[PDB]
Amino acid sequence: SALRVGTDGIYPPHSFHAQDGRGELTGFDIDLIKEVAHRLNLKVEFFETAVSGLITGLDTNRYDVLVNVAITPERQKKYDFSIPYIAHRVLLVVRSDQQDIRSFKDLTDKTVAQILGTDLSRFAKELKSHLVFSHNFEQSLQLLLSKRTDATMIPDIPFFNFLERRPHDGNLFKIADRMKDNSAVAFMMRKGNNKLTRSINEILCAIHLDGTYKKIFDRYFDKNIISSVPGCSS
Amino acid sequence: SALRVGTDGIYPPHSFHAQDGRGELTGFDIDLIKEVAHRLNLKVEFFETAVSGLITGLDTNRYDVLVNVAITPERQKKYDFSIPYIAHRVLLVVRSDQQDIRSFKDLTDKTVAQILGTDLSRFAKELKSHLVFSHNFEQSLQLLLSKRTDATMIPDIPFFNFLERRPHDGNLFKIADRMKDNSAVAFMMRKGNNKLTRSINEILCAIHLDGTYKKIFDRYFDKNIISSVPGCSS
């Protein structure tokens, strides 16, 4: 049978369409979950969904696995997680011209672009920022660059990818703050799907061991910049 | 109810007895699982067994949790694992004046000290080394000094704790090689009770988030040498 995966195909380098949106789904998490399914002897069925609906989609059983999910204690309480397969660091990104934002606590009463439905949007709302909801990271940085927002909280992976895809933009950005720790990212499943979870975990250990992980990782990321997760053991 | 934990208390800094081996059980993994247990409102019971029988006691229900277990494909097939909470890196350690051993493949036809019942012992046996079975990492280094053996494969965490405890012996040893990747380490449990695994994973994320992990880690390790696992997200 198929492996049903929910994702949003406008999040380079995680999940995005080739040939400038016209081609097949690709990206780091897409390749990785397809490799897990190949080794599981499974076809992958991708259900493209907006981020605001990814977790509700999982709840609704429209699909079985979500990619690139940050582990939180409330998500672990409510869902099953694979072993982490990557980590990101959350950054406070501002224009290089900004003067009054030097920390996360400074975002109170500032205008902040965050993706509707995300924990980062909730955090911005807890900070009593004024939210401008974006539909992906690209728009978040577009809103900042156009001066419609003062800042955005974004993980390092999509931000650095943005700088790679357009280095003229950027150099126009600066990182005002960053979380003290990086953040484990894993595949998220319905609670109780213990057998799929174990299978994914064993396949990911294999992928680490025979070098397939590093191959997928290096395809998309700068090792000197993006944090990976511990290897496995024979 | 009680959280029953199996360990062998002769492995500083993981699991060892205070007061030069005469007082209460202490250590990084010991402190961590106790903080996990307290936060789950469970009392903790420890049981000490030689390493070669730790997994047997798990299989036969004499205890529920093993600490400081390296994740392997075979183990993930047969047991449940918590999320990784530390990572070690396997070193090839020889005497400082040793000349004929530059890689793991050089261990064929050499004498090596390893702990019976461990994967490193099995690796040593598969390389066609000549095994001398030590009773812990401390003895493995002593066997190396006495020239009963010409090498020992040991993870970085206890090797560097030994350097911290006996700096003036450090000139007697050198690292001849090391694994290209580090290795995720987790709490290991019998297959089946997903509930306890999820609860441990949740509390370990909370331990990361409030600074407790860093506190326990820093009590025992040098962040400049020992690798950590990713943080969590709120």
Shared-domain flag, residues B100 and B148: yes
First and final CA of chain A: distance in angstroms?
30
Examine residue A232 and state whether it is found in any structural domain, yes or no: no
Question: What long-range pairs does B134-142 form, CB within 8 A, spacing at least 24?
Answer: B135/B10, B135/B50, B136/B8, B136/B10, B136/B11, B136/B51, B137/B11, B137/B162, B138/B10, B138/B12, B138/B162, B139/B113, B140/B113, B140/B114, B140/B115, B141/B93, B141/B113, B141/B173
Give the one of B73, B80, B230 whose C-beta lies nearest to A227's C-beta.
B230
Q: B212: burial class by Cβ within 10 Å (0-12, 13-18, 19+)?
A: middle
Select from B118, B173, B110, B176 the least CA-distant residue to B146. B173
CA nearest neighbour of B88 among B163, B217, B179: B179
Residues of B in contact with A184 (CB under 8 A): 83, 229-233
> Tokens 């990785």 belong to which residue?
A32
**B4 domain-assigned:** yes
Look up residue A59 and give its two tokens: 């709840």
| The total number of structural domains that make up chain A | 2
In this structure, the answer to whether residues B143 and B193 fall within a common structural domain is no
B167 at A interface, C-beta within 8 A: no
Q: Does B181 touch chain A (CB under 8 A)?
A: yes
C-beta separation of B66 from B58 below 8 A = yes
Which residues in A lie closer than 8 A to residue B198 (C-beta atoms)?
A: 76-77, 80, 191
- Whether residue B34 is contained in a domain is answered as yes
A80 shares a domain with A2: yes
Contact B231 A83 (CB under 8 A): no
B51/B2 Cα distance (integer angstroms): 22
Min distance A61 CA to chain B CA atoms (Å): 21
**Nearest of B85, B84, B56 to residue B72 by alpha carbon:** B84
Q: Residue A159: inside a domain, yes or no?
A: yes
Closest partner residue to A230 (CB to CB) among B184, B194, B203 is: B184
Domain that holds residue B164: 86-180+183-185
Elucidation method = X-ray
> Touching check for B40 and chain A: CB below 8 Å?
no
CATH code at B79? 3.40.190.10
Q: How far apart are CA A38 and CA A55, in angstroms?
A: 24
Whether residue A196 sits in one domain with residue A158: no
A118 to chain B, minimum CA–CA distance in Å? 12
Residue A233 lies in a domain: no
Q: Are residues A111 and A55 in the same domain?
A: no
Q: Are residues B72 and B147 in the same domain?
A: no
Q: CB–CB of B72/B32 below 8 Å?
A: no
Q: Is residue A230 one of the residues assigned to a domain?
A: no
- Torsion angle, alpha carbons of B79, B83, B87, B92, to 10: 10
- Assess if residue A227 is contained within a domain: no
Quick one: B81 and B194 in the same domain? yes
Domain assignment present for B232: no
Are A171 and A104 within one domain? yes
Per the DSSP assignment, residues forming a β-bridge with B94 are B174
Distance of CA A219 to the CA centre of its chain: 16
Q: Are residues A98 and A141 in the same domain?
A: yes
Gap between the Cα atoms of B106 and B115, Å rounded: 20
Please, which residues 94-153 of chain A have a Cβ atom closer than 8 Å to chain B?
A: 119, 123
Instruction: Tell me, yes or no, if B193 comes closer than 8 A to chain A by beta carbon.
Output: no
Q: Which residues sit opposite A65 in a β-bridge?
A: A5, A189
Which tokens sit at A206?
């294999």
Q: Name the residue in chain A with its Cα closest to that of B195.
A: A192
Q: What is the dihedral of CA B129, B131, B137, B139, to 10 degrees?
A: -130
If you write DSSP's letter for every residue of chain A in order, what string do you get?
Answer: -EEEEEE-SEETTTEEEHHHHTS-EESHHHHHHHHHHHHTT-EEEEEE--HHHHHHHHHTTS-SEEEEEEP-HHHHHHEEEPPP-EEE-EEEEEETT--S--SGGGGTTSEEEEETTSHHHHHHHHTTPEEEEESSHHHHHHHHHTTS-SEEEEEHHHHHHHHHH-SSSSSSEEEEEE-SS-EEEEEEEETT-HHHHHHHHHHHHHHHHTTHHHHHHHHH--TTTS----B---
The closest of A90, A97, A79, A81 to A115, measured between CA atoms, is A90
Partner residue opposite A182 with nearest CB, options B73, B81, B231: B231
Distance CA B99, CA B95 (A): 9
Distance (Å, whole) CA B110 – CA A212: 32
Residue A197, CA atoms < 13 Å, CB-side half-sphere:
25
- Of A168, A174, A155, nearest in space to A221 by CA: A155
